[PDB]
Amino acid sequence: LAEELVRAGTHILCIKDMAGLLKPTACTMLVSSLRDRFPDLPLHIHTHDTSGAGVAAMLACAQAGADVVDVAADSMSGMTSQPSMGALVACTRGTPLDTEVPMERVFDYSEYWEGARGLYAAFDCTATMKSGNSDVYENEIPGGQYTNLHFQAHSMGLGSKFKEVKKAYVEANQMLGDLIKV
Amino acid sequence: NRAQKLLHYLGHVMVNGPTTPIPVKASPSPTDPVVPAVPIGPPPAGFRDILLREGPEGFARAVRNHPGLLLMDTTFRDAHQSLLATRVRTHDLKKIAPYVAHNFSKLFSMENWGGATFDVAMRFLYECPWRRLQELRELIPNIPFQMLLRGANAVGYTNYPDNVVFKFCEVAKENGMDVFRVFDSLNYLPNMLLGMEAAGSAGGVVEAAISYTGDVADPSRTKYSLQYYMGLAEELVRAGTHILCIKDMAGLLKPTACTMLVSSLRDRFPDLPLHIHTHDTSGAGVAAMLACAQAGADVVDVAADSMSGMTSQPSMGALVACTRGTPLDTEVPMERVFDYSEYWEGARGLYAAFDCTATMKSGNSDVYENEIPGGQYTNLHFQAHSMGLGSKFKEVKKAYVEANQMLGDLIKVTPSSKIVGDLAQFMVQNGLSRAEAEAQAEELSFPRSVVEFLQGYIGVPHGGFPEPFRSKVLKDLPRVEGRPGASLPPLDLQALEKELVDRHGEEVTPEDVLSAAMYPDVFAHFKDFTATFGPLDSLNTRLFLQGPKIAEEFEVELERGKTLHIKALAVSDLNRAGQRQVFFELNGQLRSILVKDTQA
């Protein structure tokens, strides 16, 4: 895939993850196998911290040779979204990654978004979903299609026992074969 | 007889509404969580048998020698302490205990008691933790248990004689519990010595811990640095502890800093088992946590996925899953983790009227400047939302760091945390500033706890008291120096035991004696409520908090002796200056009880 993409002439190549299925060893060896042949081609990593370990794979990918990474607001983070930006900008004190971005900016951004999030409480997932779950490596549901999928079933009711929905989704994919699901 | 008092309580709660305080008014959703089945046979064996046979030294050595990282569960204690107001009933834990027993067999231990647990068990809630441990331990003869035990003060806020703390530890061991975690608010050596010697005289595993604060990587922050921590470790090991731990109730751990700390302690102490505790409040728990346990480590602390994130411990699912292509694989069936997480997700909706989730959304940073413990942080947050609002919680935090700093750069644990919080409350609702207030500190009448700490009761900090502030505030009061555990006049147990057995009849137990010994007044309230309402804790959480609604059926099993069903019929009207009555039907006969309204 990488050779034909490079042959196409893509300026910057990116690795895409909706379900946030990135693990440290897997990503580091993958980014090695990418950067080995392409010293001048920048890399981009995007993932969702639905499983609860997005930051671990994020640091693994960054140390493996990544250059650009996706992130969300600190108070907007966790659960199913990107790993918290405060943790990323903080955890790089002496590590050669060297962000050099003040903590106060993240603090003010997080507090503003925390204050604003209360306005949309009539359809907020936090009213329904308490925390992100590791029910992803066996369900591979994309982050943006998972929130309302759970939320309609729980809010309209009778969809609280959502297991049978996750029970059927895997073999629904299996009928079509193991398919790239975006 | 016995159900009559239960009828009185239910009538009272339906006529008057909720009894225990409620921060924000909301209705818990009527969904009953389901528990996945487990085999009926005995649960697979774990660390408890190893400790029973091999002994504490061999136990610690084997934990060191295991060819893989080990796991310790703290969902039962710290998860709800941080998120909720630790208002979880033992009824909630009973329906999940067999699941963990039969599934989670490789867990190192489990944490069940904590700092702001025993006090709240009688102050706001109405439950006895002693019988909670008594029921929990017999149901799990597989995993050793762990409490949060402070050195000088047993569970309360003030120091106690040596003998009473010794009795506390020995009876806690004799109840069937195995391992004690020993620490204190500030790393005052005699406190750890008292705790460890009490644990050793009890004959159980001694586990001391060191509070961690600041960052070792920064050369600017070296007032208490790596050499200081290793010196503390040398002192503790010279005292003699089976296992050493590093605790981060504020979740300030960072990957490479704690990695090099772990290296610098493991190379010096290859045979020494390690333990680590942290909270996800920073948002970098799993990354630093794995990169830090990669080096020489023994046990790790995790929480349920449903109560992960926010300000609690790392999710066990993430740690299990990310460690597949690694020699230190977790070896955990992962659908079991999924079932555990979904159970706790269903059970978390029960306490909907009060929750950190309702207050604040997904945890946040600023703990690197607040270092507030998670439970205390959430408690202060929702209290500031309750009396004030979310906007008035903002200045409390900037006042919190001022209150901490003016008392020196001291470790903030439950005692010190409550001290700094109360002083910050003085700071805020007294409407006073920094410079003018602290320029003249003699005249200010600080609350009882501030005078207690500045008087040196709870202990003298390793850094030392602030001489000008102490001289200004104390003025002319007796000051206790040295170790006030012995310096303060010891009391006798038999005197109070006679007093209470005469005041409340023969029905007295030594655990009740200790509980009254901390705070007699809350025990008086508890004993009065038990007398008027009889036995409890056989009710549903909805039954305890909301109770039956008009015309609905439910079953309650109080004792093994009899089985009783309940149905809600109707309510009378007010007749005698606000005195309501209710008509209810029992199995085979109707019963009618008068209930006094409270608006008279």
The DSSP secondary-structure symbol of B430 reads T
> How many Å separate Cα B514 from the centre of its chain?
18
Distance CA B313, CA B246 (A): 14
- Residue B116 CA from chain centroid, whole number: 5
Radius of gyration of chain A from Cα atoms?
18
Q: Which residues does B557 contact at the CB level (< 8 Å), separation at least 6?
A: B538, B563, B564
Q: Is the dihedral of CA B221, B223, B224, B225 positive or negative?
A: positive
d(CA A59, CA B348): 32
State how far residue A147 is from chain B, nearest Cα, in angstroms: 15
d(CA B152, CA B578): 50
Is A106 at the interface with chain B, CB within 8 A?
Answer: yes
Give the separation between CA B347 and CA B526, rounded to whole angstroms.
27
Question: Is A16 marked within a binding site?
Answer: yes
Whole-angstrom distance between the N-terminal and C-terminal Cα of chain B? 28
Check whether A154 is labelled as a binding-site residue.
Answer: no
Residue A75: which of B307, B308, B362 has the nearest Cβ? B362
Query: Closest Cα to residue B475, out of B446, B449, B434?
Result: B446
Q: Within an 8 Å CB–CB cutoff, is residue B357 touching chain A?
A: yes
Give the DSSP per-residue string, A76-100.
T-STTSPPBHHHHHHS-SSSTT---
CB A13 within 8 A of CB A43: yes
Nearest to B364 among A79, A94, A110 (CB): A110
Q: Rg of chain B's alpha carbons, rounded to an integer?
A: 25
Q: By the 8 A CB rule, do B145 and B76 touch? A: no
d(CA A127, CA A146): 15
Instruction: Write down the H helix ranges in B211-364.
Output: 226-239, 255-266, 285-293, 316-322, 334-348, 356-359
CB contact under 8 A, B321 and A134: yes
* DSSP classification of residue B79: I
Report residue B277: phi and psi, to 5°.
-135, 135
Query: Which technique was used to obtain these atomic coordinates?
Result: cryo-EM
Q: Checking phi first, is residue B473 left (phi over 0); if not, alpha (psi -120 to 50) or beta?
A: alpha
Q: How many CB atoms lie within 10 A of CB B59?
A: 23
Pick from B309, B334, B324, B361: which is nearest to A135 by CA?
B334
Q: Is B151 helix (H, G, I), strand (E, B) or coil?
A: coil
In the chain, the amino acid numbered A73 is: A
Q: Give the separation between CA B293 and CA A33, rounded to whole angstroms.
A: 27
Q: How far apart are CA B528 and CA B312, in angstroms?
A: 35
Dihedral angle at the C-alpha atoms of B291, B294, B297, B302, nearest 10 degrees? 50
Query: Distance between CA atoms of B16 and B591, rounded to whole angstroms?
Result: 20
Chain A residues within an 8 Å CB radius of B356:
none
Count Cβ–Cβ pairs < 8 Å, chain A vs chain B.
Answer: 158
Cα distance between residue A162 and residue A153, in whole Å: 7
The SS3 assignment for B204 reads coil
Instruction: Let me know: does B200 contact B189? Beta carbons within 8 Å.
Output: no
b/e per residue B117-134 (b: at least 16 CB within 10 A): bbbbbbeebbbbbbebbe
Q: Structure tokens of B295?
A: 């080096």
Structure tokens at B74: 């703290």
Pairwise CA distance, residues B385 & B164, whole Å? 39
CB B57 within 8 A of CB B203: no
The strands making up A13-16's β-sheet, listed across from edge to edge, are A13-16, A43-46, A68-69
Q: What SS3 state is found at B270? A: coil
- Using alpha carbons, list the distances in angstroms from residue B467 to B106, B404, B475, B551, B583: 51, 16, 12, 66, 67
Cβ-defined contact of A78 to B290 (cutoff 8 Å):
no
Chain B residues within 8 A of A56 when measuring between CB atoms: 286-287, 290-291, 318, 322
Distance CA B32, CA B351 (A): 12
Distance CA A49, CA A70 (A): 11
- A28 at B interface, C-beta within 8 A: no
For residue A159, how far is the Cα from the chain centroid?
25
Question: Does residue B342 sit at the A interface (CB-CB below 8 Å)?
Answer: yes
Note whether A79 contacts B306, CB cutoff 8 Å.
Answer: no
What is the Cα–Cα distance from B277 to B212, expressed in whole angstroms? 10
Round to whole Å and give the CA distance between B270 and B265: 8
Is there a contact between A111 and B308 if contact means CB atoms under 8 Å apart? no
* Residue A46 known to bind ligand: yes
CA distances B421 to B124, B169, B436, Å, are 19, 29, 20
Q: Do B111 and B77 meet the contact criterion of CB atoms below 8 Å apart?
A: yes
CB contact under 8 A, B337 and A134: yes
Other residues' Cβ atoms within 10 Å of the Cβ of residue B162: 16
Angle at A12 between CA B286 and CA A109, to 5 degrees: 45
Identify which of A83, A93, A126 has the shortest CB distance to residue B361.
A126
The number of angstroms, rounded, from the C-alpha of A65 to the middle of its chain's C-alpha atoms is: 18
User: Which residue carries 């001489």 as its tokens?
Assistant: B467
Report how far apart, in Å, the C-alpha atoms of B462 and of each of A61, B1, B150 are: 43, 57, 16
Of A76, A86, A130, the CB nearest to B345: A130
Q: How far is A8 from chain B (nearest CA, A)?
A: 34
Helical H segments across B349-481, by residue range: 356-359, 367-370, 374-387, 393-406, 414-429, 435-439, 448-454, 467-474
Tokens of residue B200, six digits: 């050793």
B361 CB burial (10 A radius; 0-12, 13-18, 19+): buried
Residues of B in contact with A51 (CB under 8 A): 317-318, 321
Task: Output phi, psi for B71, to 5 deg.
Answer: -120, 140
Nearest to B545 by CA among B3, B23, B1, B175: B23
CB contact under 8 Å between A133 and B307, yes or no, is no
Q: Confirm or reject contact between A137 and chain B (CB < 8 A).
A: yes
Please give the residue of chain B at the shortest CA–CA distance from A23: B322
Consecutive H or E run containing B148: strand B148-150
- Using the Cα atoms of residue A145, residue A149, residue A150 and residue A156 in order, give the sign of their dihedral: positive
Distance CA B365, CA B363 (A): 7
Give the DSSP letter of residue B43: P
Pick A52's closest partner by Cβ from B34, B286, B324: B286
Both tokens assigned to B281: 């409040």
User: Cα(B237)–Cα(B232) distance, rounded to whole angstroms?
Assistant: 9
A82/B contact by beta carbon, under 8 A: no
Chain centroid, CA A140 distance in Å: 12
> Where do we find the tokens 């069940």?
B112
- Token code pair at residue B490: 């010891």
Long-range contacts of the stretch B381-389 (C-beta < 8 A, 24+) = B381/B356, B382/B23, B382/B24, B382/B85, B382/B354, B382/B356, B383/B23, B385/B23, B385/B24, B385/B359, B386/B23, B386/B24
Sheet holding B564-571, edge to edge: B553-556, B564-571, B579-586, B589-596
Cα–Cα dist B36/B449, whole Å = 47
Please report, for residues A98, B3, B34, B328, the alpha-carbon distance to residue B558 in angstroms, rounded to integers and kept in the order given.
62, 8, 21, 47
Angle at B181 between CA B205 and CA B42, to 5 degrees: 65
* CA proximity to A137, closest of B288, B317, B331, B280: B317
Query: Distance (Å, rounded) from C-alpha A154 to C-alpha B31?
Result: 11
Contact B364 A114 (CB under 8 A): yes
Q: Which two tokens stand for residue A88?
A: 């990323």
Q: Would residue B373 be called left, alpha or beta, if left means φ above 0 and alpha means ψ between -120 and 50 degrees?
A: beta
